[PDB]
Amino acid sequence: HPETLVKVKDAEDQLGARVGYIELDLNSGKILESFRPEERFPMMSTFKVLLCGAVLSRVDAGQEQLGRRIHYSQNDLVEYSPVTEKHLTDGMTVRELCSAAITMSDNTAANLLLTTIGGPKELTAFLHNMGDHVTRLDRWEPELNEAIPNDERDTTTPAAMATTLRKLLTGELLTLASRQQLIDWMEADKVAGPLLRSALPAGWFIADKSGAGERGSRGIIAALGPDGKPSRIVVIYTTGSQATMDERNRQIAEIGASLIKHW
Incomplete structure (x- = not known):
């Protein structure tokens, strides 16, 4: 609805930075509303959903096992590894x-x-192979969060990401069991509390993945809907703002409040 673009445009004004937005019908693939849909933005941690999608594609094809155990050490640890820093001794599957x-x-x-x-x-290559000729990951953590202006490395567009997430969660791309595993991981997302989840009504479903990077980069991808089932995908990215994390989180939450109000 047009009133949600009023909020997205307002978000741009308050943050003094570009904001990309798209709302997609999950079932039909129809773009319901958008703003800077094909402009590039840093994915930051939102890429981790695509990564596990590729992992699950390997599992389905008999090239990987979910129970396989990976051993690592102190040397492998990079900034912000709250779970991994606790399993150095016996590794994790x-x-x-x-x-x-x-x-x-x-x-x-x-x-x-x-x-x-x-x-x-x-x-x-996995992404290009499934029809996403836009999204690209070029570096590893944490350098992929640099968000250098005009740099295409490690970026996606709201349209590209929304379409890719739709294919991952409803396409024949992944088996039914893998599709649901990916959704279950997103549904259990624990670090996106002040974003879309703070605008979600009781009874609604949400599976999401947020991200934060340098130079004010922030974003979130999500599949959400009423009565416990997802029915639309929403992608929000911004980069370039000098605003505080709280101010950035509030703008995303208000865009969220608006799209829920006009559902």
Whole structure:
């Protein structure tokens, strides 16, 4: 609805930065509303959903096992690894790593998982292979969060990301069991509380993944809907603002409040 663009445009004014937005019908793929849909923005941790999607594609094809155990050490640890920094001794399985990367945004978990699929290059090949000729991952954590102005490395567009998430959660791309595993990890997301979840009505469903990077970058991708089932995908990205994390979180929550009001 047009009133939600009023809020998105307002968000841009208050943040003094570009805001990209898209609302997509999950079932039909129809773009319901958008703002700067094809402009590039840093994915930050939102890429971890795509990473585990590629991992699950490997599992389905008999190339990976969710129960497989990965051993790592102190050397592997990078900034913000709340789950992985606690399992140095006995390691963690592929399943526990996707859980950590998605629900807690654990950077080391993401790096270990990228390593299993062949690095950023292979995640990008996976994406191109499923029809996303836009999204690209070029670096590892934490450098992928640099958000250098005009740099296309590690970026996506709201349209590209929304379409890709739709395919991952409803397409024949992944088996039914994997599709649901990916959704379950997003539903259990624990570090997106002040974003869309703070605007979600009781009884509504939400599976999401947020992200934060340098130079004011912030964003969130989500599948949400009334009565416990998702029915639309929402993607919100911004970069370039000098605003505080709280101010950035509030703008996203208000865009969320608006799209829920005009559902």
